[PDB]
Design an enzyme around this catalytic site. Sequence first.
Site, mmCIF file in Angstrom:
data_model
loop_
_atom_site.group_PDB
_atom_site.id
_atom_site.type_symbol
_atom_site.label_atom_id
_atom_site.label_comp_id
_atom_site.label_asym_id
_atom_site.label_seq_id
_atom_site.Cartn_x
_atom_site.Cartn_y
_atom_site.Cartn_z
ATOM 1 N N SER A 52 41.794 -45.413 36.910
ATOM 2 C CA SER A 52 40.987 -46.669 37.714
ATOM 3 C C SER A 52 41.303 -46.245 39.226
ATOM 4 C CB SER A 52 41.335 -47.852 37.343
ATOM 5 O OG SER A 52 41.262 -48.677 38.425
ATOM 6 N N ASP A 192 42.562 -64.731 36.479
ATOM 7 C CA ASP A 192 41.190 -64.498 36.574
ATOM 8 C C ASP A 192 40.874 -63.698 35.463
ATOM 9 O OD1 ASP A 192 38.419 -64.347 37.256
ATOM 10 O OD2 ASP A 192 38.691 -62.733 38.705
ATOM 11 N N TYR A 196 36.365 -58.075 32.262
ATOM 12 C CA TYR A 196 36.662 -57.025 33.078
ATOM 13 C C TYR A 196 38.102 -56.589 33.020
ATOM 14 C CZ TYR A 196 32.094 -57.549 35.487
ATOM 15 O OH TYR A 196 30.799 -57.730 35.685
ATOM 16 N N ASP A 208 45.650 -56.671 32.762
ATOM 17 C CA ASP A 208 46.309 -56.660 34.355
ATOM 18 C C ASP A 208 47.131 -57.718 34.361
ATOM 19 O OD1 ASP A 208 46.973 -56.399 37.093
ATOM 20 O OD2 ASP A 208 45.380 -58.031 37.288
HETATM 21 N N1 LIG Z 1 47.500 -49.994 30.238
HETATM 22 C C1 LIG Z 1 46.383 -49.213 30.195
HETATM 23 N N2 LIG Z 1 46.019 -48.401 29.464
HETATM 24 C C2 LIG Z 1 44.945 -47.729 29.769
HETATM 25 N N3 LIG Z 1 44.015 -48.039 30.968
HETATM 26 C C3 LIG Z 1 44.332 -48.785 31.789
HETATM 27 C C4 LIG Z 1 45.465 -49.498 31.481
HETATM 28 N N4 LIG Z 1 45.750 -50.487 32.521
HETATM 29 C C5 LIG Z 1 44.687 -50.290 33.220
HETATM 30 N N5 LIG Z 1 43.918 -49.556 32.858
HETATM 31 C C6 LIG Z 1 42.378 -49.114 33.787
HETATM 32 O O1 LIG Z 1 42.859 -49.424 34.965
HETATM 33 C C7 LIG Z 1 42.264 -50.688 35.426
HETATM 34 C C8 LIG Z 1 43.357 -51.685 35.180
HETATM 35 O O2 LIG Z 1 42.627 -52.993 35.400
HETATM 36 C C9 LIG Z 1 40.982 -50.838 34.869
HETATM 37 O O3 LIG Z 1 40.580 -52.118 34.402
HETATM 38 C C10 LIG Z 1 41.352 -49.844 33.440
HETATM 39 O O4 LIG Z 1 40.055 -49.302 33.312
#
Ligand SMILES: Nc1ncnc2c1ncn2[C@@H]1O[C@H](CO)[C@H](O)[C@H]1O
EC number: 2.7.11.1
Length: 253
Positions: A52, A192, A196, A208
């Site tokens: 990301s 929030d 997403y 997140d």
């Molecule tokens: N722990 C995790 N394992 C794999 N992918 C992760 C992750 N944490 C985040 N992503 C990707 O990055 C963004 C995080 O909000 C995006 O929302 C997401 O696409």
Amino acid sequence: KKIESYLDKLRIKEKDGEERKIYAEVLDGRTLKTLYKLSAKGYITAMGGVISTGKEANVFYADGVFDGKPVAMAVKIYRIETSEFDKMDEYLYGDERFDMRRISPKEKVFIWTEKEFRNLERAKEAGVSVPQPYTYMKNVLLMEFIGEDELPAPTLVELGRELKELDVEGIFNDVVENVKRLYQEAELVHADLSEYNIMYIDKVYFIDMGQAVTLRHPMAESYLERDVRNIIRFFSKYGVKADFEEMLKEVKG
Ligand SMILES: Nc1ncnc2c1ncn2[C@@H]1O[C@H](CO)[C@H](O)[C@H]1O
């Protein structure tokens, strides 16, 4: 002729032209040092592709090691340059874990990283489905990769109609049990919560946790009701029917 940077000290898989450029564009020198240090301490084995890219933070894949076992990691790196009274400055109100009297505008990204780490810990201890947190240092946080074979799991918004092939009704209920555990045992509320930032492989994951406030935050209740609305809104689109005040009750208990 002097090397520009120490980027080549990191172990980056498939470090062709373009891969290097991406790293060289997003890492500043201070961040580079921190990643190097995590690699030398044994946490990061090799870094992989971009997962990301975002305003406040970028996320990369890494293979690494935690508690003596090989793991796949998401390496979340907060941009150090921060503004202007962030939303995340406000997300600290009422948080007893963190003493303003100790903290200075310059280091504020370090606190946000810290706070995300401790929120993951807290949520995991309450039985919330979040990435297992591994460690953090500075603006870098290392946690469990939610995905398979370096492909991150889809979010709910990526799945859309497809959710109808996976029991969309059990999925909503899974989302609801997680918000309930977060509220009642972790005593947190996501600022929030939405399609997403919820992933799905064979169960939901909330991914997140940096945008989560304690229940002493002035807007805890508001954010909770907004989260409930977001979730019913999104799932109602796929034929799940549910009541606001009955879900809010389920969460709040
Ligand atoms: N722990 C995790 N394992 C794999 N992918 C992760 C992750 N944490 C985040 N992503 C990707 O990055 C963004 C995080 O909000 C995006 O929302 C997401 O696409």
